[PDB]
């Protein structure tokens, strides 16, 4: 029709059908057929070994440290508490200027914690301070939407996810957005860095996940398998795969090199959304926190559920596996954190 | 060794007792979320009560009111940040007739939210003077936008102000019942809606919110003891 809008709509559909054909072309088998001869992991019934209390409101984020002992949790009571999970003692309690917090990270060097929320600001806190007490060091501004997730690469570069449908790589010292990631239509809710820092994925409310090159700022692969907002994302320990959970009550495993979904973890008695996902050290176990007050542990190869964590009194808002694989922690809207193994 | 354990134990003690002092402050603050479309009188209402935040006291009772205006227009994922607020103050313009259908749809989406099942809403029907202006002028009639208004009967419980035209009484009680028809359709005693007729010069909004919060907590305690 000559009108350049109709020519872009046509080339759009042409690309979507070339992509659907190139995707079904390599789907010679399914993951279930591949894993039908494996032995099941058996029933895994882990129990709550510790419980970390103190928070006055609903918790939204946690991240284990590299030492596999400490972890930080952010609640909307205006606090960011750092715990020594071995002795259940609290190491720090950082009050926040804005009480609306949605994410928190723990630097791999254990030197810094980060957090942000509806203030559209990413706040960095230096655990190694010279005057005595942890206080604000940096504060990253620029987003027109809230802050949904953030994870350190090193002590100076950090990537953020925001509700302005963009992600950004920051230089903590200069405070400049060294790299911008645009292309999502809806709010980006979660990001996950690969184990080798070279790439990272992001799950947005457009029911899509995107793989981003940190240093180059380009989107390499876009996956569309979920029917609704992506709420959680996490890399396989190998680095070439990741799992996502969405509001459509389903978990999906995508591979980077095959560029499509491999397997879907769901049950027809599960209707409520998914809030957090994380793999074990070997990637055989996938832990997910649900709206149904439970946390389900899946066998990442057989789609069988191998246990439940019915210990929270409200929606499980976050979870995380230790770097040594010794235990998993779960944060919920009941104002309690629980350690399981 | 064991000394670092005693230092960690007294660090935890100082932490838990700071959080103990913080708990008493947080327990007595009544968080109120202000929501509503633009071109409403919400921001003027906040200006009158003396940006993002507001802190005000009525009779030794603290309130902390927040409007989410620095975000985008997708009110979906951040709504779950207000599941524990004491009340939502929904502000509506009573003189706009099509803007008002948007307000009804937003009120319906707030009232049936999965995460706001227990959040009561205070409905402010602002700009009643302009509504009276438009009704007495008779150039834009409600029946063209709400044909139900033709068959609407002034309620027998209506309390018109001295000199108020029966047309204005029927118009503002008609808007009152389109919002009560939504609030009573699925509230089922878990939460309630308290309508109020307001104008831009009215200064009794702060008292009305205090009375409504009193009623909200009264009806929460009554339901907690299985009376109401």
């Amino acid at each position: 029709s000559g009108s350049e809008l109709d020519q872009l709509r046509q080339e759009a559909e042409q690309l979507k059908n070339q992509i659907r054909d190139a995707r079904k072309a390599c789907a010679d088998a399914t993951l279930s057929q591949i894993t039908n001869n494996i032995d099941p992991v058996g029933r895994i019934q882990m129990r709550t070994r510790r419980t970390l209390r103190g928070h006055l409101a609903k918790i939204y984020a946690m991240h284990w440290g590299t030492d596999s002992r400490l972890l930080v949790s952010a609640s909307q009571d205006g606090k960011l508490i750092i715990w020594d999970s071995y002795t259940t003692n609290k190491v720090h309690a950082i009050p926040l200027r804005s009480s609306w917090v949605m994410t928190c990270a723990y630097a791999p060097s254990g030197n810094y914690v980060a957090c942000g929320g509806l203030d559209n600001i990413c706040s960095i806190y230096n655990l190694k301070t010279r005057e005595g007490n942890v206080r604000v060091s940096r504060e990253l501004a620029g987003h027109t939407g809230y802050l949904s997730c953030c994870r350190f690469l090193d002590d100076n570069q950090i990537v953020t996810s925001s509700g302005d449908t963009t992600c950004a790589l920051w230089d903590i010292e200069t405070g400049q957005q060294t790299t911008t990631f645009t292309g999502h239509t809806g709010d980006v809710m979660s990001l996950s860095l690969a184990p080798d820092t070279r790439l990272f994925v992001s799950g947005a409310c457009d029911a899509s996940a995107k793989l981003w090159d940190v240093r180059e700022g380009m989107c390499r692969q876009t996956f569309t398998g979920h029917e609704s907002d992506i709420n959680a994302i996490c890399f396989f320990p190998n680095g070439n795969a990741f799992a996502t959970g969405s509001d459509d009550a389903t978990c999906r495993l995508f591979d980077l090199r095959a560029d499509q979904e491999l397997m879907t973890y769901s049950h027809d008695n599960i209707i409520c959304g998914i809030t957090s996902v994380s793999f074990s050290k070997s990637g055989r176990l996938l832990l997910a926190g649900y709206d149904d007050f439970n946390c389900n542990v899946w066998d990442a190869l057989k789609a069988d559920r191998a246990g439940v964590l019915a210990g929270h009194d409200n929606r499980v808002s976050c979870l995380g596996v230790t770097d040594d694989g010794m235990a998993v922690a779960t944060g919920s809207w009941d104002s309690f954190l629980k350690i399981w193994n | 060794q064991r000394n670092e354990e005693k230092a960690q134990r007294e660090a935890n003690k100082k932490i838990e007792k700071q959080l103990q002092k913080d708990k008493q402050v947080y327990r007595a603050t009544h968080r109120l979320l202000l929501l509503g479309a633009d071109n409403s009188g919400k921001s003027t209402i906040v200006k009158q009560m003396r940006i993002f935040e507001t802190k005000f006291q009525v009779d030794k009772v603290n309130f902390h009111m927040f409007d989410v205006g620095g975000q985008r227009d997708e009110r979906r994922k951040w709504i779950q940040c207000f599941n524990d607020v004491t009340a939502i103050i929904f502000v509506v313009d009573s003189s706009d007739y099509n803007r008002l259908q948007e307000a009804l749809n937003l009120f319906k989406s707030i009232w049936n939210n999965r995460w706001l099942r227990t959040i009561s809403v205070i409905l402010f029907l602002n700009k009643q003077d302009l509504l009276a202006e438009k009704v007495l002028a008779g150039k834009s009639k409600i029946e063209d936008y709400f044909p139900e208004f033709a068959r609407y009967t002034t309620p027998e419980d209506a309390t018109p102000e001295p000199g108020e035209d029966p047309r204005v009484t029927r118009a503002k009680y008609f808007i009152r019942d389109e919002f009560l028809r939504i609030s009573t359709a699925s509230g089922d005693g878990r939460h309630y809606c308290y309508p109020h007729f307001t104008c831009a010069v009215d200064t009794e909004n702060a008292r009305r919110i205090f009375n409504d919060c009193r009623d909200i907590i009264q009806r929460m305690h009554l339901r907690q003891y299985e009376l109401l």
Partner: nanobody, 128 residues
């Protein structure tokens, strides 16, 4: 991938009856509340009709009440909007929108700038 395509609509004299069909793919149509909204030139998005999960409950705005009808079919995965006795003010681009979450009576889909689950839309013009 969520996909919504509107079809139908065009130039027609006032008083004509016309049916728009929204085809949906990428989700289980039975689990989502649906809306038909429109954007007239010179004004923003406004909601027109609403249909529930099973079609038991429907709603319309007062502007188009008594003429517009909304009907969904879960079996063939398609929404429909019928207009009768069109008026000169009914000239707008019609969007079929999906309410964001399954198993919920909530909808936040009148967003003017960007919504992730609305179709391209069709032009419906009423003129003489």
């Amino acid at each position: 991938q969520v996909q919504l395509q509107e079809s139908g609509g065009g130039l027609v004299q006032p008083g004509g009856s016309l049916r728009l069909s929204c085809a949906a793919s990428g989700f289980t149509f039975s689990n989502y509340k649906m809306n038909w909204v429109r954007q007239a030139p010179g004004k923003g998005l406004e909601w027109v009709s609403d249909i529930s999960q099973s079609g038991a409950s429907i709603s319309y705005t007062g502007s188009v009440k008594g003429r517009f009808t909304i009907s969904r079919d879960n079996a063939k995965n398609t929404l429909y909007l019928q207009m009768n006795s069109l008026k000169p003010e009914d000239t707008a681009v019609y969007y079929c929108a999906r309410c964001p979450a399954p198993f919920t009576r909530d909808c936040f889909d009148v967003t003017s700038t960007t919504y992730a689950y609305r179709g391209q839309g069709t032009q419906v013009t009423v003129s003489s």
